[PDB]
C-alpha cells in the first residue's frame, strides 16, 4: 500500500537526498519535487531524529538535538517530505 | 506500522547511531534478536543511501561496489 522508499512516520514520507546542497538549493530541490524540508518540531521527539539529524530543516538550520552557527555557507544532506 | 526505520521487502532495519566496534555492534543486534545487514541484500537497493559506511554482517563496512577493519568504530543497523 506504501511506495515510500525511505522514512514513513505519520502519512509523511521522507526521501533522502544524499547530495550535499546549501539550504536554499535543498529547499528549491524539495519544492521542485512538490515537497518540503522536514519540520524540526515534527521529527525532534521521534525515532526519525537518528536519520534527519544534522540535515537541513524547514526552519533554515540543521536539525539538532540541542556554537555560533554560521550556516549560510554550509552544505548538508536533506530529506524531502510530500505527497 | 511498527517499523521504526527502513522497510525493504519484509525486512525492517533500525539505525543505531552509537559508534561501536564490529563485535560490539554484532552483540547489540544479537541482544535485540536481530542481525547486521547483508551487503548483497542492500547493495543493489535504495537502502545503500542509508546503510553505506555502516557495519555489515561480513565484518566490513557496506560500500557501493568496491571489493585494517579491527579497530574501527561505525554505526550499524539491526533487522
Amino acid at each position: 500500500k506504501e511506495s515510500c522508499n525511505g522514512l514513513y512516520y505519520q502519512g509523511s514520507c521522507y526521501i533522502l537526498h544524499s547530495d550535499y546542497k546549501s539550504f536554499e538549493d535543498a529547499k528549491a530541490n524539495c519544492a521542485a519535487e512538490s515537497s518540503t524540508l522536514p519540520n524540526k518540531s515534527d521529527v525532534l521527539t521521534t525515532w526519525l531524529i537518528d536519520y534527519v539529524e544534522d540535515t537541513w530543516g524547514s526552519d533554515g538550520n540543521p536539525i539538532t538535538k540541542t556554537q555560533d552557527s554560521d550556516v549560510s555557507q554550509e552544505v548538508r544532506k536533506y530529506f524531502c517530505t510530500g505527497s | 506500522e511498527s517499523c521504526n526505520g527502513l522497510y525493504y521487502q519484509g525486512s525492517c532495519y533500525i539505525l543505531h547511531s552509537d559508534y561501536k566496534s564490529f563485535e560490539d555492534a554484532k552483540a547489540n543486534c544479537a541482544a535485540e534478536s536481530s542481525t547486521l545487514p547483508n551487503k548483497s541484500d542492500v547493495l543493489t537497493t535504495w537502502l545503500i543511501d542509508y546503510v553505506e559506511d555502516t557495519w555489515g554482517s561480513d565484518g566490513n563496512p557496506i560500500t557501493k561496489t568496491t571489493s585494517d577493519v579491527s579497530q574501527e568504530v561505525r554505526k550499524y543497523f539491526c533487522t
Partner: antibody
Amino acid sequence: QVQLQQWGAGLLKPSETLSLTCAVSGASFSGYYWTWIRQPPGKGLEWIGEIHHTGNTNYNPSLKSRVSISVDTSKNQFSLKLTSVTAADTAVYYCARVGGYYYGWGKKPHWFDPWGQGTLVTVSS
Amino acid sequence: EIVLTQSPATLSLSPGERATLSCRASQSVSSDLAWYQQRPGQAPRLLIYDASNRATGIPARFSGSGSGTDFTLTISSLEPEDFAVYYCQQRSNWGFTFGPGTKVDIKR
C-alpha cells in the same frame, strides 16, 4: 567560518620524523574528517591521510608504512607523524577539512574545504 | 588505484575567452569528483564538488559537468584572476588522488 592553523619543524635531516599539528576553530571538530595533503615543490598534490574524532584513520597505501595521524579532541587539534623522512618528502604540507559533514551513514564526502595556509618542510642535512 | 589524467597540460587563451578543461579517470568514479584552483604561492581553493555543484561564493562563470570517467570544467569568460593551475580530485575505494593539473596561460 572555519579556520585552520599549522605549525611544525620546517627543517628536518634525513631519517628523522616529521611532526606537524593542525588546530581548528569556528566549526564542529567532531563532525568532519580531517586530512593532510602534501605538495612537493613544483609538482602535483598528494593525499596523505585522514582522521575522525572517533579515532578512525585512513592512510594512503603508498605512505601507510610511515604515516600516523593522531587527534586531540580536547584541543580541537590533530597531528601528523612521518617517520624515516627522505629527500622526496620535501613538500608544502596542508591540513584541510573534508567539507561534507560526516554523518556516519550513507555516501561519504569527497572534497576538501577549507585548506590550511601550509607548512613547508625541507629535508636536508 | 584510480589514476586521474588532465589534458591539455597547458591552455593558452586570451582574457574573455571560454576555457574548457577535461579530466579522465582510469575507472568510474561516479560523481565523486572535485575541482580546485591554485595560484602561485597559495593553498588550493575548492571550485566544484560532486562534479556539478559550485562551492560557496564561487562565481557563476565556473561550471562543472560529467560523471563516471569523463569530467569537464568550464569558465565561460576568463578573468585575469582565473589564470592559474586547476587540479582534479576524486575519492574511490579507500583513498583520494589528484590529477596532474592544467595551467591556464595568457595567449600570445
